[model samples]
Target chain A: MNTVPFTSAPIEVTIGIDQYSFNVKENQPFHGIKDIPIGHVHVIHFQHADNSSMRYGYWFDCRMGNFYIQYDPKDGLYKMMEERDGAKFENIVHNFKERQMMVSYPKIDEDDTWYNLTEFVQMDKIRKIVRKDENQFSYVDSSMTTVQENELSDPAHSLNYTVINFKSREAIRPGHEMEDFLDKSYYLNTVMLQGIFKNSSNYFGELQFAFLNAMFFGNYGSSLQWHAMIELICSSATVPKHMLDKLDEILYYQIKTLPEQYSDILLNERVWNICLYSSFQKNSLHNTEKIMENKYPELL
Target chain B: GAMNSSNYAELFNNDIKLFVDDTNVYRVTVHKTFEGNVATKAINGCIFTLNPKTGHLFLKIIHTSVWAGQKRLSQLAKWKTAEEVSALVRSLPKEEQPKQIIVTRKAMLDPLEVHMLDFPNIAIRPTELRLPFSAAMSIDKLSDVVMKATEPQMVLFNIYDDWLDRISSYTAFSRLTLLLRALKTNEESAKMILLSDPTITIKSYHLWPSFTDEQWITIESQMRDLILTEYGRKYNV
Candidate 1:
């Protein structure tokens, strides 16, 4: 056992029956020094209206910001399977029982939530275990998976994608979390960075490819870090004031949209910065409008 | 405050990366090495967190099980080319004796590659700390290595930003002042970075206003608490 200290926000455990609150940590604790939140066995138990019950044991890796279902809820022991970016089609299983950690999902009937999707396959409906580790076609031109998929499907969304450091147990991948993604994307970062799309070659099929591409707005910046990518997308200059209507047109339009839209993103730094800098209401927005004009859509 | 790239250019590669998150430098990389030294294939199975930091942790593990020395060469030799000579060391006395072979090589770092900006202006880079070969068995012992290796200190953080927009306007400064006081009251670390939003359009950091020495101090430490007490080595048995 390692001897460094890491106290987490506590396990936000809840039976969700009475009061339905599952967050850990109360008020403030001494914050001398702490690293990533410690991992633990956390469970979310559901008590159905029919007096039935189910539970999923998971390790919510605070570092990677994704959930790993460690124990199958039904078997109470057998490994559970997770699908990759389970958006209608690309839902491949991430099995956790034996050596094979890859499998595909075959519905007990049709498409259903984890609610009806409960219970082991009575008919032994094994869809297909496509174990394509060590460079499958996944690298043949894969688009970065969108975050919105998590909202549409089960927690299995992005589960397979976020894992890294594979030994006996797995560690979280970098830059997968929203927090790190935002931090690394800074325009002025000096720290040497590994590109987020390093594994851009890993792709399953062209189907999810087109869907993911359309969702991210045909983003060219997909291949570079946020800071490097944005800088690559930027330029500097001086111009004669005699001809500047087009510049002002786009600049004026983007002004109010600044805080109105990015109020969540901007006007604050990292959590440490925000907690240490602001006085009254925590992370609030500043009306920051930095106007610049360049041929944006023209390049692509 | 007056922040720019010159002050932080070196810290971008120093141990500071393990602590805080701001400072406009990009440090970690995903698949390919920045130096482009090795074929990307040799490092493929090794996936990383890759922000501004990666690989340093894995480097410590490639040691030899014999004598706690060398790398995949077993103390036969770490950090050197060795395939040309390994059979010579393991051979008892045989024609199978072929000689020679090969190899290579961050600092204590956070998973996200965020620089730890909390400090009191006294800069001293800690000597490199290597995990004993025994700790390589599992990551459990690895955490202890990082905790002890990162000796906390007090130093002025030289952060970089598009401070033109951050400092020039009164309205933006009004909100910025909120954080200056916040850092003064509740933090040992300096105030810091909010990464750029990728979804938006037309952003740049090349545009920063020059700062007077006085302007820079406002963002660093707003109080005389600089003389206050500092904590010792951290723990948890």
Candidate 2:
């Protein structure tokens, strides 16, 4: 394990941050669409930067695939709407309707009560054999099959929409490179719940996992926390103009931090240089080397 | 181009099975109160099957939450960002490191955020994409000195995947049409189109809709031509 430069180990890291800020309950959504109606086949709209576009259609059943199209709503009287109300609705809107697609979902069943999640997986109470010193984060595991199996139950059923992504939007693209960034973040979101089911004994495992996580995550969490802290500062700093013109936007973020934490971590006693340089120099596309060379001539 | 060679090399030599660890010790979330305190729940994720031979750990979250448990692994691995995780993921082929899994309830409901995707397979993009029409609703207009703009360029989409399977009628369909209609004109919709898929599959999970031959052809023709002209042109525009 490599310690980020500047922060000592275990101090900066903490338990993971939840992606959603709201307490998202299954049957009781305070607001937003909970029950989006299901269509026979869901269509994906791929609008290129141009008003022109591509539409990919797929049947979730077994034929999960893409549809190829050169869609122009001009044929469906959409052309008339564009000419008449062109200023109001871009050609994109005319085709959006002609193609007939819904982006967000509607609310699900209002009457169904919350389902008990534990009935579907093992709720094991591990003997606290590993000393507290072991630093293991407690976690409750659930089965993907469990959710995959329960595809039809009401309102909760609305949790099944999946969007197949293609093409990168420039502004937000740099942030997507992290590992487990997507799956841990989005792949199977509908099934997990935090509070114990009002009537179930098994849902309690999550409680134990939380306590365990606080204890264990702290071990390496601090270093990473500081890593982010430094990067955040540099992102705000003004860069010399010459450097800005040459580096890609992504590289700017990676090396934006001053004091060049990568080399600092590399030279640390406890951390490994192989892990630091090998990963940054090789796997990372960001410009760590340039930042180091420009910011700290002394380090070399 | 920088991370490409390493990623491709890992994919080619690596066991795609271990990549996700389809089979492992799965756990359920549980709640336990301590000595007259307000009851709290924990992730209760389980360890991957320990293998002295391969040094591999695997786990998956069913219900998604912030995954407080993930912090432990992140600490152990000392990974900086989710992007930094790929190096370890790619190194798995040669090194022996421990792997673990956890299931979070909130995350399971619907997951969000950035994704890492291969740059190759560029032209033949995936065909299935969907989001809330309201996802584009005057999303950014809700900003200013009086009001703060949201997380900027945030893509509006859902994670639950089963809504399509439970529908009983078409009134719901009409409502969606109204919402999609609204999405057509919203500006602060931020206009973000992603090339990678979200980790979660919400709203349309089980009820895969099948299209008739003519419907399929209509959609296919529309998709291909649009990709070439509108979307293709937009790349340069």
Best prediction by DockQ? 2
Residue-wise lDDT of candidate 2 within A4-53, one digit each (tens)?
Answer: 01101111111111101122222221211112223211111121223222
Off by over 4 Å in 2: A1-300, B1-207, B212-217, B229-233
Top-lDDT structure, candidate number? 2
Could you tell me the lDDT of residue A281 within candidate 2? 24
Which 10 consecutive residues of model 1 chain A have the lowest summed lDDT? A121-130
Assess every candidate by TM-score: 0.15, 0.17
Q: TM-scores of the first chain across all predictions?
A: 0.17, 0.17
Candidate 1 residue-wise lDDT at A136: 16
Candidate 2 deviates by what RMSD? 37.0
Clashes of 2: 118
B82-171 in candidate 2: lDDT tens per residue?
A: 222233344455344323211111121111113223322211111121323223222222111112222112211221112334442233
